[PDB]
Structure 1
Amino acid sequence: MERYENLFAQLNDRREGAFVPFVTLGDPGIEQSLKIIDTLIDAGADALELGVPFSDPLADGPTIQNANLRAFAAGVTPAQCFEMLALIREKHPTIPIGLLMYANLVFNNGIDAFYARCEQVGVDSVLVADVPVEESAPFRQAALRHNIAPIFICPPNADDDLLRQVASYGRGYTYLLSRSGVTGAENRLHHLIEKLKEYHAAPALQGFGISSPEQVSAAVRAGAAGAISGSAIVKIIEKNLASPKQMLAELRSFVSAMKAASRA
């Protein structure tokens, strides 16, 4: 939790928004994933959103579906993901680390024990993609007990009861959903941003379909705290599977361009 509050305070002092990429842990392999993640940080990433591979990711479009299967093709397991997460934290003390989870992986060995393991390896937040605010009570309670920010989705079809709910219950950042549907860069909000600030919500990050520098600058201009980009990054991985070195160079140039767009 603490790392998001420190990041957003620094970004505002630097008159910058946050750029936050998403990747699947272990896509396309453990060793290459760790190099991917270090490149994203070194290229300008302000925080990370990291997926644990799951058998049935019903909130992901085809780009991240294939990322999960690539990770499964490498034999990646949740336990290997949490060893990666510890190593990532040991290398990067200030970078906020958020997890994108599916409910069964959090519930499998006990919800409280999941969040305790998150605290032990230094994760900062957890978004559970198939837990709506209506079902969130045991997840957010376990999260807070272990100093983990529970991340809530503010959809575009939200009403004022939902806005007050996400504002009260969330920490770290509010995930400002761009649109209906699933994750993807094939399918490309100021009103919600003001009410969220009115209700003292966690700072807002827009996600779902951010693929271009113009969209990052748009999120900052709308008064959001930053923008999240998952499929655009994963697509670069998917394009360059045969050339690991080119993959990192293409990742570096995209992240650098997206982070540059967050100054204004």
Structure 2
Amino acid sequence: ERYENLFAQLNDRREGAFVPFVTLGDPGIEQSLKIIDTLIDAGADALELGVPFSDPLADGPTIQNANLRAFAAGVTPAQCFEMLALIREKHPTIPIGLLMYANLVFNNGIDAFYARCEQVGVDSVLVADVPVEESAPFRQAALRHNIAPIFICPPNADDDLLRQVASYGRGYTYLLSRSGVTGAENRGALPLHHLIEKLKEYHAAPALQGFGISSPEQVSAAVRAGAAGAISGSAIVKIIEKNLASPKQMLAELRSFVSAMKAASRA
């Protein structure tokens, strides 16, 4: 299982995971594939990949506009699964996670969605607008298709929710840095050592911290606090948007940024 293998290796090396997020198909299919190949080559330990959704209610403006760009290119979920199949054929060991909105999972059949995830080699699915309280049919279909169901540990979590997330989640636990929606401009400030340690006590999947992580200093800080890694999306997407007219300057700047973030995860 790719997540267990990843975290075992990083543990041996005294390292945390750096996990970039991009929207599949932003700004186009071909450049998106080049972007992801660059994130990996530049040091990404895992991937989080979004499927453009018409109404992304957990995303701030940076990722809203990434969705809009994918739509301007005609990106459909079917094309995203084609991309996912190719990415997996290129990179057999990297964990591939999807960040989904519920309607895209539900509307052609929950089971069929996770069956297609298994066909293309996806390792995990987070459904942003399905809390653990609603997750049963999603969890069951993920597990039935050898997909890890990812659950969110919010900073306002209580003990009953910690136990649920620890018991039902697989692969990694998504540790939310703060309230609000995605965005690099808003950095989380609450200390999370208490939640991180509770999750370990309950044998939860290793925690990756996400939301508002956009500097190497935040990556080292999440690792110093016990988290097994960090996710960064808006910060990476902002580089895409800033360089739309220079596809190769974009890859250059993506490479530089990822290496600097992954470096901060080392030790």
TM range (shorter): over 0.9
Superposed CA deviations along residues 128-162 of structure 1, whole A, max 9, x for unmatched, are 00001110010011000111000001000110011
C-alpha root-mean-square deviation of aligned residues, in Å? 0.4
Give the TM-score, by structure 1 length. Answer: 0.99
Q: C-alpha separation between the residues in 1 aligned to 2:177 and 2:227?
A: 12
What whole-Å deviation, never above 9, does each CA across 1:234-258 have from its counterpart, x for those lacking one?
A: 0000100010010000000000000
Q: Distance in 1 between matches of 2:93 and 2:13?
A: 16
Deviation of the 1:108 alpha carbon: 1.1
Cα distance in 2 between the residues matched to 1:159 and 1:241: 43
Q: Secondary structure at the match of 2:265?
A: coil
Shift of 1:5: 0.3
Taking the aligned partners of 1:129 and 1:259, their CA distance within structure 2 comes to 25
Q: Tell me the distance in 1 between the aligned counterparts of 2:154 and 2:231.
A: 15
Listed one character per residue, the Cα deviations across residues 215-246 of structure 1 (whole Å, up to 9, x for unaligned) are 11111111110000000000000100010010
- In structure 1, what is the equivalent of residue 183 of structure 2? 184
Picking from 220, 223, 226, the partner of 2:226 is: 223
CA distance in 2, matches of 1:244, 1:225: 32
Paired residue for 2:214? 211
Q: Cα deviation per residue 1:109-144 (whole Å; 9 max; x = unaligned)?
A: 110110010001000000000001110010011000
Residue 118 of structure 2 corresponds to residue 115 of structure 1? no
Please give the alpha-carbon distance, in whole angstroms, between the structure 2 residues aligned to 1:179 and 1:260.
24
Q: Secondary structure at the match of 2:185?
A: coil
CA deviations on 1:87-118 (whole Å, 9 max, x unpaired) are: 00000000000001000100011101100100
Runs of 4+ in 1 over 2 A off after TM superposition: none
Q: CA deviation at 1:45?
A: 0.2
Identity of aligned residues (%): 100
Q: Deviations over 1:12-58 (max 9, x none)?
A: 11111000000000000000000000000000000000000011100
Measure, in 2, the Cα distance between the counterparts of 1:78 and 1:54.
9
Cα distance in 2, alignment partners of residues 53 and 217 from structure 1: 30
Query: Helix, strand or coil: the match of 2:255?
Result: helix
In 2, the alpha carbon distance for the partners of 1:108 and 1:131 equals 14
Cα separation, 1, equivalents of 2:248 and 2:117? 31
Taking the aligned partners of 1:262 and 1:104, their CA distance within structure 2 comes to 34
Matched, 1:255 2:242: no
Task: For 1:171 and 1:52, locate their aligned partners in 2 and report how far apart those are by CA, in whole Å.
Answer: 21
Following TM superposition, by how much is the alpha carbon of 1:182 offset from its aligned partner in structure 2, in angstroms?
0.2
Q: Secondary structure at the match of 1:261?
A: helix
Q: Partners in 1 of 2:13 and 2:256 — Cα distance?
A: 22
Give the Cα separation in 2 of the matches to 1:209 and 1:4: 23
Cα distance in 2 for partners of 1:218, 1:95 equals: 24
- Correspondence for 1:131: 130
Please list the CA deviations of residues 171-216 of structure 1 after superposition, one character each: whole Å capped at 9, or x if unmatched. Answer: 0000000000000001000000000000000000000011000111
